[PDB]
Subunit: 229 residues, 4 copies
């Protein structure tokens, strides 16, 4: 059974390891995927790798006009969204002493502002009963040297899954966060290795799929046990 | 990737094959290609459950609070299948009693089924568990809430969640993952965002995630399957 | 200005009061003006502890796993002081055993002291607890960790933490606050915890006592059902 | 040796948001406990009234903590008047309710500027004055662990605040500086204690974190919510 047969998915960060692995799994599970990213060349290469049932959309998700353009494309080509994987994110290490206004704004714009507006602008297209997955991080629950803004931003992302669970419940839209650990640390991790992108994708699939139909507002750690022991 | 049968040729042991959740899980496991042992106290209801499941299932009568019963179970598994890939340690019982009402007998009944029994269930499965296998523990939303008259049940289910952490550590050299599932309301109640009780088959689907290779980088977790109850 | 005596004329009952955190807490409580009952199994160690505390203390020999010993305790408390303002249910014992090693006896001893004893300690205190009183439970960082060979201890301490939530609900009509304290390492394995702890050391028993005093005192009057980690940051980073 | 009666005797405390509410009640208790307090806020008149209410051992400083230059001015005052900081209560915060569909860029930036950016630069700029072994308290909220209707940005920002307590515990451990978050509930039906909290009850919990009683307490989230989030 194709677990996303004929579903429409939008994946932001189709330039990340996890966004591409997710797109591949989703196409293997029968979905039509829009992969979204800032860098056109890697996007087009990714779409060529995936090979079928995929459209690449160049967009900077921090720019409201780019989001409007994305959604117009999705509306015209597929008409509605079943699964939204809001997978933005970038880290720059700076200690508290080293933080500048620019570093703060870059970190929060990509990890938080971009996410909020990605999901806001998807709402008209999202089907009732749909599924929204947010990318948090183990950093959201840890105290890692020089991850000040990144960890704080990923904590913000996890919180938005709770709030959107409440706000969207009338439409039966589930919102859940995935919190990856180290993806290709290993020493602190019970499984004794970094995770493969396809293992993160499989977890995202769980959340996108009907197997998680009674799962809402959670933080799914995909970290080999790092944060759990 | 996708597979018609996500547990093909795997051997699963499910305790609480008299419960709604244990039964629904056995059905889904068989649908996924597994061979299932369903384990429970009441033989007749077990044999009816095995008839409902319909194929690739052995019913085993066993009271998991009795060590000799566990030894009998594992002998049966060893003779029939030879190894265990997935262990769903799912026996449980709830009785409501407030603190002022708690008796020694109530305490012991709750802890013996939910904690002592679970410990010995898993301990005695270790020689048969395959490296790289998956163990799923049934905790509960009760393990993180303060529900009137759930004193011992909630405490015991918090203990169960703890054991998933400890056993993640202790079994890591064998690459055996240990995870807890924490159901909310299933079939009956006890604000929930999804606005309804869960179905046993929805819990089963989440256990399947943990049993399956889709959760291969998932270890030590508490997976709430509660329609959002504990998350907002 | 400040209060000289933060527990002035309050009556406290501390189980496990004969040593460690229970003893440090009894000392601080007495310093803060409380009258304390210290409870333990061995008369000689109790008498030594009472002598160290030095004043405003009654030692009561009792095995808190034995219902009859609890009844005897609370008869004494009622006679001598009438009612209880603070109950620090501070039982606890650890024996390391891996899953493979666990015997029924090891299970029962761990749960009897950490959980059964606790439940009955609190149950039997109820008629004497003043409304607005404070009940402090001893959990552990082990309750949230996956520590090799701590199977039963960790699980028991998780159960303790849970009871603080349930008892918060049950006792809210009486305005009795119930909170858990979760110590880290307190003065090889100890060195391993110190290295993983931000503050880079084990805690002193008096620092645990001071945290229990927060929960016993009016400073925590709007704190209920919590798990207060007192671990130098071990579990928080 | 026994306990000290005045639990912040001669310590220097800086309290942002010190003109009202929790920050004011904290300032009053800190002064009762023997501290010297700097109360920080945006409006002169309210600050002067607050300082008159506190009544002694207090300096009011007008500053918008979202402006780096206002923070530099604050810390120059503290450095000249007291010389060092023992306790920092980084008590920023403001809520505007908006649902996801309603959020604008301006609403987002206001919420994050006051609750997160302001906090970060408040603590950053205090570092040179903070004594080794000092205590930093951050104001998070119960919102940081809940899914409340129309609290999208506020809740998210308060979760970010709690995270920073973790990171700063790691970064500041070599100086033995403790960083903890306080998460208030309702302050003056779902709460076990069956009432809102008084500002003085929040101040007492902040006092615990500021004081030596919490010397082995680091990186935590102290819920002061009458049980709301715990049951």
């Amino acid at each position: 059974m194709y677990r996303l047969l004929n579903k429409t998915a939008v994946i932001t960060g189709g330039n990340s390891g996890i966004g591409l692995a997710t797109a591949k799994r989703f196409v293997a599970e029968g979905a039509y995927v829009f992969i979204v990213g800032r860098r056109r060349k890697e996007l087009e290469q990714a779409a060529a790798e995936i090979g079928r049932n995929v459209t690449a959309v160049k967009a900077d998700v921090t720019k409201l006009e780019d989001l409007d353009r994305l959604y117009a494309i999705v509306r015209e080509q597929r008409g509605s969204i079943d699964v939204l994987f809001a997978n933005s994110g970038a880290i720059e290490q700076k200690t508290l002493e080293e933080i500048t206004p620019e570093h703060y704004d870059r970190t929060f714009d990509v990890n938080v502002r971009g996410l909020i507006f990605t999901v806001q602008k998807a709402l008209p297209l999202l089907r009732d009963g749909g599924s929204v997955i947010l990318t948090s991080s183990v950093a959201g629950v840890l105290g890692l040297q020089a991850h000040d803004t990144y960890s704080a931003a990923k904590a913000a992302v996890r919180s938005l899954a709770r709030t959107w669970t409440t706000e969207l419940k009338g439409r039966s839209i589930r919102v859940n966060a995935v919190s990856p650990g180290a993806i290709d640390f290993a020493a602190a991790t019970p499984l004794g290795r970094v995770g493969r992108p396809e293992e993160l994708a499989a977890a995202v699939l769980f959340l996108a799929s009907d197997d998680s139909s009674y799962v809402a507002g959670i933080e799914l750690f995909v970290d080999g046990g790092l944060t759990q022991v």
